[PDB]
Amino acid sequence: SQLAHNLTLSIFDPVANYRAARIICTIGPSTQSVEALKGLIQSGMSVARMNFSHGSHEYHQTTINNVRQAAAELGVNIAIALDTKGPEIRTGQFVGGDAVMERGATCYVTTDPAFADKGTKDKFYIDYQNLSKVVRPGNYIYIDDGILILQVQSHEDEQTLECTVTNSHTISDRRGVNLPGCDVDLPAVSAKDRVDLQFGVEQGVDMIFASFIRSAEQVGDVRKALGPKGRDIMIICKIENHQGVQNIDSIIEESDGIMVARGDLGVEIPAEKVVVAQKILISKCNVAGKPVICATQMLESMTYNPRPTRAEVSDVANAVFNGADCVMLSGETAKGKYPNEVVQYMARICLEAQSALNEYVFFNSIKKLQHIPMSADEAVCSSAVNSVYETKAKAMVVLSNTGRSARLVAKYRPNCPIVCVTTRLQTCRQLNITQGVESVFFDADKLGHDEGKEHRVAAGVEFAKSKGYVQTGDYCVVIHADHKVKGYANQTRILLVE
Amino acid sequence: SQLAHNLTLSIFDPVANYRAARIICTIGPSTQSVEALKGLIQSGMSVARMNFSHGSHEYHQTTINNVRQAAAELGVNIAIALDTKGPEIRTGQFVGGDAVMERGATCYVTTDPAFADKGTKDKFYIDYQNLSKVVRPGNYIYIDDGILILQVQSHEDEQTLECTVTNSHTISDRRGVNLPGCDVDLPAVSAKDRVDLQFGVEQGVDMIFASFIRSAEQVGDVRKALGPKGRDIMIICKIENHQGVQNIDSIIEESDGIMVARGDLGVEIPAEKVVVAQKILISKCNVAGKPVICATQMLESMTYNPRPTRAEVSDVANAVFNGADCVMLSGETAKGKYPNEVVQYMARICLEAQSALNEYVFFNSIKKLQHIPMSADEAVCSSAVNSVYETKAKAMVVLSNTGRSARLVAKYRPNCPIVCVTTRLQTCRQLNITQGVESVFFDADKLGHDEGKEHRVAAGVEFAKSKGYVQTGDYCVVIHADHKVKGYANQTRILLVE
Amino acid sequence: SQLAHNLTLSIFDPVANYRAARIICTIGPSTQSVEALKGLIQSGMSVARMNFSHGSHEYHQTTINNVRQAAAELGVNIAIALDTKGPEIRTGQFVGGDAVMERGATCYVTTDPAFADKGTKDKFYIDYQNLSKVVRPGNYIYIDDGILILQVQSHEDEQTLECTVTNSHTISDRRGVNLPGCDVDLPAVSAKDRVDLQFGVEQGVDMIFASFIRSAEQVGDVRKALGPKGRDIMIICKIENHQGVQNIDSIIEESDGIMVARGDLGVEIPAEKVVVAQKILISKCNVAGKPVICATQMLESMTYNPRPTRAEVSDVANAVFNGADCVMLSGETAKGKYPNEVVQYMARICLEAQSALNEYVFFNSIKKLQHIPMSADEAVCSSAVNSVYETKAKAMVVLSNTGRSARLVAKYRPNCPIVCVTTRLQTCRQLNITQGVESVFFDADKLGHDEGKEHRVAAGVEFAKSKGYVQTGDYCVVIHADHKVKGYANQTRILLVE
Amino acid sequence: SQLAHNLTLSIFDPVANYRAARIICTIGPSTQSVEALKGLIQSGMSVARMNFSHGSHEYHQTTINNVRQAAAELGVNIAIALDTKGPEIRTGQFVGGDAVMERGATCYVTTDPAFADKGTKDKFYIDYQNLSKVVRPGNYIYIDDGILILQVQSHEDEQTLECTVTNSHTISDRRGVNLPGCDVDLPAVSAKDRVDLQFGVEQGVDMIFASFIRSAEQVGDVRKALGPKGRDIMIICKIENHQGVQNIDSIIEESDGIMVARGDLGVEIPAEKVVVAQKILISKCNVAGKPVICATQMLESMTYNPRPTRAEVSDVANAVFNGADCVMLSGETAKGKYPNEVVQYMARICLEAQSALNEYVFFNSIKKLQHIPMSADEAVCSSAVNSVYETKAKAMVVLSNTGRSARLVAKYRPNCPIVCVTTRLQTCRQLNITQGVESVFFDADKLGHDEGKEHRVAAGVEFAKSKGYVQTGDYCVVIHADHKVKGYANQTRILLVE
Ligand SMILES: O=P(O)(O)OC[C@H]1O[C@@](CO)(OP(=O)(O)O)[C@@H](O)[C@@H]1O
Ligand SMILES: O=P(O)(O)OC[C@H]1O[C@@](CO)(OP(=O)(O)O)[C@@H](O)[C@@H]1O
Structure with missing residues (x-):
């Protein structure tokens, strides 16, 4: 618990x-x-x-x-x-640059564009043309960070709403508005x-x-x-x-x-x-x-x-x-x-x-929530993490070019660093939003396609050695395809590090 | 989960x-x-x-x-x-009211009371007479909210410590000091x-x-x-x-x-x-x-x-x-x-x-952690709460004069208000630090000792009705002693409210 | 586990x-x-x-x-x-007292009552008048403890079934029959x-x-x-x-x-x-x-x-x-x-x-399966048992006249004897099919109605002392109503035994 | 549950x-x-x-x-x-071929070999020379399937025990004896x-x-x-x-x-x-x-x-x-x-x-009981089974020559057949005591050592197809070593079957 x-x-x-x-x-x-x-x-x-x-x-x-x-x-x-x-909803301009909204007062908010440069405390423009269709009597209209709260009383006409001012606040030109009980339909x-x-x-x-x-x-x-x-x-x-x-x-x-x-x-x-x-x-x-x-x-x-x-x-x-x-x-x-x-x-x-985090409970909790069956690569990743916990492996290496394989693994919350070896630099950047993952770029052009996977694997392991995650005699759990399979990883290996 | x-x-x-x-x-x-x-x-x-x-x-x-x-x-x-x-640890006074501590500088901190009104950036007083016995070389001495961090280098003598200044900061008279790696032994x-x-x-x-x-x-x-x-x-x-x-x-x-x-x-x-x-x-x-x-x-x-x-x-x-x-x-x-x-x-x-809170898991979690055997009153409270969850009771009433019974119940985290009926006003105040409990004072002097418990019970129930926790047909789970037992509550009842 | x-x-x-x-x-x-x-x-x-x-x-x-x-x-x-x-299904009589059924042979089973005293291996009576409506081609008809297995081939007529004999067996007068794929509709x-x-x-x-x-x-x-x-x-x-x-x-x-x-x-x-x-x-x-x-x-x-x-x-x-x-x-x-x-x-x-039995797991397992809410008396019994486990109580006493209260308690599998005190002798007998319960009869007529429950309680405790379940200083968990409630037990007490 | x-x-x-x-x-x-x-x-x-x-x-x-x-x-x-x-313990012979043991009677059991062909109800031979050292007064000595129960009263001498006959029974030559409260020390x-x-x-x-x-x-x-x-x-x-x-x-x-x-x-x-x-x-x-x-x-x-x-x-x-x-x-x-x-x-x-069997609970229960860490091959087998449950794989293939790998997998109770491919015929026989496993022999001599494992794998999969466990589009979870590792299996693969 x-x-x-x-x-x-x-x-x-x-x-x-x-x-x-x-x-x-x-x-x-x-x-x-x-x-x-x-x-x-x-x-x-x-x-x-x-x-x-x-x-x-x-x-x-x-x-x-x-x-x-x-x-x-x-x-x-x-x-x-x-x-x-x-998309933003904003008021128009007020005369004199400013407009002094008092509590209890009645004001009129309109989407008639004639009013964009001549609002006053009495009547001013909000630039969202659908305002009237989206709001009903009783709804609230927030202006200025939600500071000024107007309440909608009625439709004066098809473009103008009669409002009550619920609290005092001076508002200047072009404040943002919100519509909390309202389904806003800007594009x-x-x-x-x-x-x-x-x-x-x-x-x-x-x-x-x-x-x-x-x-x-x-x-x-x-x-x-x-x-x-x-x-x-x-x-x-x-x-x-x-x-x-x-x-x-x-x-x-x-x-x-x-x-x-x-x-x-x-x-x-x-x-x-x-x-x-x-x-x-x-x-x-x-x-x-x-x-x-x-x-x-x-x-x-x-x-x-x-x-x-x-x-x-x-x-x-x-x-x-x-x-x-x-x-x-x-x-x-x-x-x-x-x-x-x-x-x-x-x-x-x-x-x-992270110290306080129970990575293990998190792994199991996540695992129970997946639909069964699911996918061969997903099972490989989940079970590979399970391997990490079972052996106390201190690092993990995965091969991902799209970055897909790496997210799939990270998803299972291993208690060790995950090292992704990728042939795309963008993938290295994109993986910067995935927790617990570090990327090593492998230049396919300079170093070849590495179909047998031995090189990419060596690089991920070396990187792990270099950052000190592993030393000789440690287990590293490794994920990629075998020689035949393409497009996903169907394999896991536990290797000893030298 | x-x-x-x-x-x-x-x-x-x-x-x-x-x-x-x-x-x-x-x-x-x-x-x-x-x-x-x-x-x-x-x-x-x-x-x-x-x-x-x-x-x-x-x-x-x-x-x-x-x-x-x-x-x-x-x-x-x-x-x-x-x-x-x-107890507080403070520096003494500095000459000119102030003292300008530079990074890299050596200064001397002494508990010699001769120095309380004549410190300088060079040497000043800290008023904790045991300073030297409590600190060792390498330890840190924080002054001014921890803003100025001196490091202890050596014992200049039995009352004076040679320090390095690790970061720049001007300090005025009588700042508080802390000793983070130090067992402070003020009374x-x-x-x-x-x-x-x-x-x-x-x-x-x-x-x-x-x-x-x-x-x-x-x-x-x-x-x-x-x-x-x-x-x-x-x-x-x-x-x-x-x-x-x-x-x-x-x-x-x-x-x-x-x-x-x-x-x-x-x-x-x-x-x-x-x-x-x-x-x-x-x-x-x-x-x-x-x-x-x-x-x-x-x-x-x-x-x-x-x-x-x-x-x-x-x-x-x-x-x-x-x-x-x-x-x-x-x-x-x-x-x-x-x-x-x-x-x-x-x-x-x-x-x-509180809405997000899982009161039920909390009850069970707490319950598992108690050692067996425990105590008759403790079992009564825990099981009474269990009764609350089982019936969906909307209120609880307990009789406590010391306030002990009330803490014991609140401890089990029921999902309903707990109403404590007490004969001590101080108890009503003291219970203000216990979550989920409300007190009703019953004046024993005016209304009698209530040995059969019916009056105190009626008052707690009425209070529950009054605040709207319960209506007729609701269950209220009630805790007190039976007619014989004294000093604790050995009884629970589920009563229907009219 | x-x-x-x-x-x-x-x-x-x-x-x-x-x-x-x-x-x-x-x-x-x-x-x-x-x-x-x-x-x-x-x-x-x-x-x-x-x-x-x-x-x-x-x-x-x-x-x-x-x-x-x-x-x-x-x-x-x-x-x-x-x-x-x-209700029983039986064959009729065979001529010569007996009839020799060979494997592979065809025979006719009829519900025509004309045949009850003149069956033969060729055709005999089964006394269940609905036989034909209940069985279909392919269904099996067992005779003599299921020893002789006839298979139904067709309806010779509205009262007679043509059967194959699937295995050899001599059958004497009036054997029982079964119908394993058949919904038998005897009253x-x-x-x-x-x-x-x-x-x-x-x-x-x-x-x-x-x-x-x-x-x-x-x-x-x-x-x-x-x-x-x-x-x-x-x-x-x-x-x-x-x-x-x-x-x-x-x-x-x-x-x-x-x-x-x-x-x-x-x-x-x-x-x-x-x-x-x-x-x-x-x-x-x-x-x-x-x-x-x-x-x-x-x-x-x-x-x-x-x-x-x-x-x-x-x-x-x-x-x-x-x-x-x-x-x-x-x-x-x-x-x-x-x-x-x-x-x-x-x-x-x-x-x-019983030694091997995990009474505790059984209690919890049963408890999880009950629908919430259930009933005040049910909660009292379950939580009272929980009290037994928490204190290590060595006996339990319940008051039941119908025997209902006693079954409700026994249902929760306490790890100690349950002693039921009843005012009905039949209840004592009826409780002989409930596990873990022993009955003490209390003669209401001779000893009174015992509304305050003290006498019945003393008797159950004494019985527990007498059989050696408890000694002084032991806890006994006791279940009955309080002074007001009638129709069920709303109370639990943990009492020390002297 | x-x-x-x-x-x-x-x-x-x-x-x-x-x-x-x-x-x-x-x-x-x-x-x-x-x-x-x-x-x-x-x-x-x-x-x-x-x-x-x-x-x-x-x-x-x-x-x-x-x-x-x-x-x-x-x-x-x-x-x-x-x-x-x-090793067996037997009585000797009795005179007249037989000996009539009555309830309440005293008889003498001896390990003196002089008596092996001349026992009587009065005194006879038991052929376990350590009888006297192993038994004490009060111990029971069972003869004839445990039918005749003698009780040991005393040591008449260093080779002879005085016994009571506790129940009547005629015993013939050379019955087996048991010693239920006795540590028997035959080789x-x-x-x-x-x-x-x-x-x-x-x-x-x-x-x-x-x-x-x-x-x-x-x-x-x-x-x-x-x-x-x-x-x-x-x-x-x-x-x-x-x-x-x-x-x-x-x-x-x-x-x-x-x-x-x-x-x-x-x-x-x-x-x-x-x-x-x-x-x-x-x-x-x-x-x-x-x-x-x-x-x-x-x-x-x-x-x-x-x-x-x-x-x-x-x-x-x-x-x-x-x-x-x-x-x-x-x-x-x-x-x-x-x-x-x-x-x-x-x-x-x-x-x-087997239908009623909860194979899944069994897998998890077993898994919790293993010491962590354990062994790379053990993790591979356990996690591979976990893969089976996660994908709903309909078969499993393992390579084992000693039969070790196969027991290790079967141990985890997958819900599908396990197909072991072995290069030893004896292994196929020995595996006949392991639940849930079927063996395919692969003749290394005729077909080569198969270091890349592709052949043995094809054979196990084919066998699975042949018995109907799998069809195309099914998952088969496969276990063996990778190309480098020797002596255990460090790899799991989920493969699609064609
Ligand atoms: O880029 P993603 O989609 O993560 O796929 C990577 C997986 O595919 C494989 C197999 O195709 O890539 P690779 O061909 O580069 O070796 C696996 O080795 C690798 O683990
Ligand atoms: O003050 P604490 O220690 O909580 O004790 C209160 C319990 O004791 C009792 C029994 O003595 O008090 P009371 O005599 O006031 O009725 C119970 O009714 C009550 O629930």
Whole structure:
């Protein structure tokens, strides 16, 4: 039981020689410079995130170049993620630049575009043309981070809503709005996103963090916008609203992974619910074998302070316990004072939680949840991990070119490092969101196709020796195909290391 | 499994009609006024904490009077806790008021009292006379919140340590020091504490939060200082250092409960370890049936902001999941901007986590950990809870005068409110640190001794009806003695409510 | 696991001071005499069975009188069971007294009553008028213990079946027939049974072992034949054919208990299946809380020999492991050479298996299978047993007048004797089929109604002292109502014995 | 739970396409002829047992030749087992050929050899020279199958015991004696056995069923008598007395397997205990991975009747449920009326029990009991079976030359047939005592050493196709070494069948 086990823990237990969980950093003004990026990598960053809500192609290009240059200098592979601006609902302008909303007052919100540059406290524009169809009397309309809460009373006309102001707040031009009891039906991809997705393909980004995913159909639309050139880019779906949570199984099916986008989700859904949503979404991703990310306000105070709050530390740790592949940094690295320190703190917490983690229970729990039968490669991976626990093997080596084999193994939560040997560099980057995995690139061109698998295997083992995971006399559990089979791994071997 | 179960959760699940967890508030300048206190109670405060590190008997008296007056006005019983200053290690004074410590420099720390008003960056006084005996070469000496880290190189003489300065920092007069690899042997109770403990007895406080508990022997010394007059005051032991963690079983034995004092513990022990310590200590308290409190930096940002960080919310929730009876507020209520809001937020998070909580697994887990044989009353309580789950009983009533019976029941984590009927008002207050329990006072003097137990039972049931926990046709599971037995409860009944 | 546990067993483990399982003996020519019956009781008989297939009211009356006289002399209460003849299918007479059936031959079986005294190997009568409607081409018709197997080829006419003889066998007048792939639709109760049931009511028998129960409807018909005068007589349903097995849940619902009637079942169903049927039926009875009996050929060789076969000993033991309340003796006591010895052997085996029995796993297993909620009295019994395990209580006392409370407790398999205090003598007899229970009669008339329950309780405890189950300082777990509640027991107490 | 599961069973469930359990037949006058043996094999015999207590080398040779000739004709491999006479304790002769022992009488038992041909009811010879040293006053001495029970009163002298006769019985010349509370210290191997063991080596028998094994030291003595020429012959140790049961772990260590020799054990140990001993011994063998046999009186009545008793059928079934590799036939095939039928009945019961068997629980239960870590090949086998359950693989193929690999796999109880491909014919025979395994011989000489393993693998798969275990599209889980490793199998593959 989790209880009994808590009882076996000690604060003085030594931590592991490897950190399974992966850290994602958003790149902003604090972290754009190659020197800053180098600091981040050394501090522990595996994925760099660009938020297309901010900046421009020009700004983001600089980031891409800088990431590649910094990584190259440090001899490492870093995933690059494009985080779309996505569809937004905004108010228009107010006369005098500003508008003073008092509690108890009546105001009128309209989608009549005549009003975009002449709102007043009395009547102003919200730019979502379907506002009236989506909202009903009683529904709430949040403006300015959810700070100003208007309540919908009636349809003055087909484009205008009569509202009550429920609390006082001055609002300036063009605030964002939310609609918590409302199924928002903006397209999956805005016009800027479209230009945003193409750019991502062009500059060869590894993954897309797709904002605001309402549906399985929307993911497909994203896949389709990426096109043929974009087929191997991973689409990670951010769950930030009600519809996304509701549609999670279908979204998970379509996607390559999930982000638990807590900041938006937190407004959209009452905040106390975000915890249940985190546990559910992470678990469903774990069971499915797809990467899952916990995001937002994880170490927020460290945007300005050298040290985190107790609640924050607890939060990074619980996300790992929850089963997340990744934790994420937003403002703390984009605009913060202590970018290197925040990352270093997060890594340290992740390592500590990892000691407490019962990797074994996790393996068995996951294993019971799989449909039987399933697939030959899946059985190979699961049983191979079981072999790891049975022999106390100190490392694992897998051959994956797509990266599929590696996710399938990592999914089973072995208690040792997993070493993936890949013939694709992008695969090395893409695997930066999978917990517990390290990649070794094997250049097929220079070194040949390695059909008998002996070379790739030697390289993974050597890498394991090099990082100190194994010494002679240790077991290493190895996964690939035999000589005949193609397209998956049908074999496991336990080899002694010399 | 915890996994499978996460899968059954929903964000839209309705929360409970009762909140099990209890909130503790520290009373400072923001919250001293009767009006402020009334706001706190309404917001959800069950225990008011006075920190004797700050203020004076005079200041704290005002708090006591104000708490009682506010509670009286609201018709409620609020526990009063005395939080001792405890033994402190401080530096002396520096010449010019200040002293500029540079990285790489050598300085001398002495316990020679000749130096208390004439330290300099070169040599200054630390007021802990045993410093030299407790520290060895290689050990670290933290000054100013742990900001300035000196390392011990050698014993210049029997009272003076030659130190290296490991990082730059200007330090002013009389900073606190810590000794993380060091067994500090200050007495359990300072001279001020002694005057502090007596005052607490005199003003009739409910509990002591005893700072810095190193040992079982120390608790006894506290018990002894309280004296005969003080025998029914609960001693809650704060675990804030290494020795306290190491000695936890024996401390738990001696104590009436534990506090996981994260702020001090966090310096003393590396911070990433505080998480393991939290899980262990809470669990050991749950298994033992004694109240456990999670403290410090739980909603820290709310000292200054209307809304919490994501890490903070996650932290309050995980503490409940961890199994804590209580969560605590420190600065957020002592000196904060939004005292009512912070408490309201904490209560709301606690209620939400409670939905996710698997009360049933918790009951069984706890039950397996008890040694056999145990005790007739313990079996009665455990099996009575089992009855609650078996019938789906919506309330529970227990008779306790000492409060013992009530803790014993609450310990088994029923999924319904527990209603305790007590003949002692102090018991009603003392039970404010036990999760899931509500007290009804029955005035033996006015209403008689009630030996057949029918009256006390009627009152608990009526209270349950009144708060809406039960309606006619519901089961209420009831615990007390039969007609012969005295000193414990040997009986359980399932009664139908009319 | 059952495995690990087998590992903790030893042949030299001392057996218990009590035998939980109950033994049933069929009374025949060997055992009718009062002296023989006295030997049987001393040897271990708790229930005496009269088989109404044999004997007459006159013969069986002698048995009843003798049982009562023997029991009275020995100061004990013995249940009396009436085992009905039930509906039978028989052939008619053959010419010359006999008829020689050869393998490969054609013969004709008819229900034309003209043929009842003039069958021949060529054509003879079977007295079940529905034979033709119930059988189809391909079905088998067993005659003479299943020794002669005819196969049905066709309907010669509406009353006559053309058969193949599948194996050679000479058959004499009036052999029994079976129909293994056939739903036999004889009435539940024959005309003789009807006279048989009334007689049982008149002579005040404790239970009916109702032969050949096909259906829930049939049990009701039995209940109805017993009438109002017969309402408190238990109907134990013997499962001896296909339909009975198929309809077991509904039959179990209607019944007061089950017999696994292996001898008939063994012909009807292939023999290798009887094992699966035994395990299922016993388990379903255990889960339901109703008494279950394992019957037939249990110690068969002991009909003629002083000592049993290995297979036999294993069989009595496995029935206990299976979870049976009772084991039964048929021919071994009805017509056998060593009636006392066979019973003594069975008792000894039962005691030995009981040591190996994991009473605790059995308690938990049963407990998990109950639907929540269930009932206040059921929770009281289950949790009270849990109390027994938690304290290591050496005895249990329950108050039951109907005997209901006692079955409910025994159902939970405590590891100590259960002592039932009853105000009905019939209850003491009826409880002779419930494992692990001993009855003390309390004469309400002589000693009063005992509403405060103190007297009945003292008597059960004294009885426990007397048989040596408890000594001073031992715990005894006690079950009854409190002062208000009537109709069930809502209370448990753990009392110390003096 | 076993309970819940019983609930999922049905009598109409179809049985498997394979029978896991193996049947052993003792060859006597009824079964010696090649035609009889052919009938036995077809009926289901996998092992033929020769009992060297009866017959002579000459008689047994005929059996060996006949077995080989019958097997050869049927194209099958049948194991040959030599069942030793072993050490015996016998009385001497009585005057007049006979001696009439009355209850209550005093008689004298002596080891003075002067008395071997002149015993009388007054004084006679028992031929075990250590009788006096091994027995004490109070001990029992059984003569004639345990029929005549003498009790030891005193040592008349150093070679003679004064006895009471406890029950009447006429005894003739040279009856066997037992000593149930006595540690008998006959040598492991008699002089005839020695000639018996050598003969077995010479005629190339597969295994020895070693009678009466008291100790681990004794097994070694057997191993040593077999010699170098005899090194690959399996020693199966029969547990027939107290000492053997007591010393079971050490005996199991030394042995290649166990027989639960119920007929002797049943006298030696009280019969009701044989059940506990059966469960323990079988389980310990299962956990250890060594073959275990259940023996004696399993279908005894079928020595004379066409059909078994209910107790008998239950007995064969429970032995399978117990976890036995093998069931055995003794008299039923040696001297019986219906040798083919008895075997056919046993096979049928075994198949039926197999349906009820929870192979999966058995796999997991066994797996938990293994020490971790263990061995690379052991993990390969266990995890490979886990693969079978995960994919629903319908067959398994293993390469074993010693037969070791095959036992290791079978040990884990897969729910599908296991097909072993071996280069040794003796291995094919020896594997006839391992449940759930079928052997295919691959002639290394004719077909080469097959180092890449492709041929042996093709043959096992083809055999599986041929018996219908697999069709195209099915998974077959395959076990052997990779190209480098020698002496064990380090590899598992899941292959699709075409
Ligand atoms: O790229 P994924 O899809 O993970 O497939 C990798 C697996 O396929 C194989 C077999 O085709 O690749 P490879 O041909 O490169 O050797 C296995 O060796 C390898 O483990
Ligand atoms: O105060 P604690 O120690 O909890 O004891 C309370 C129990 O004792 C009893 C019995 O003595 O008190 P009471 O006399 O007040 O009725 C029980 O009724 C009650 O449940």
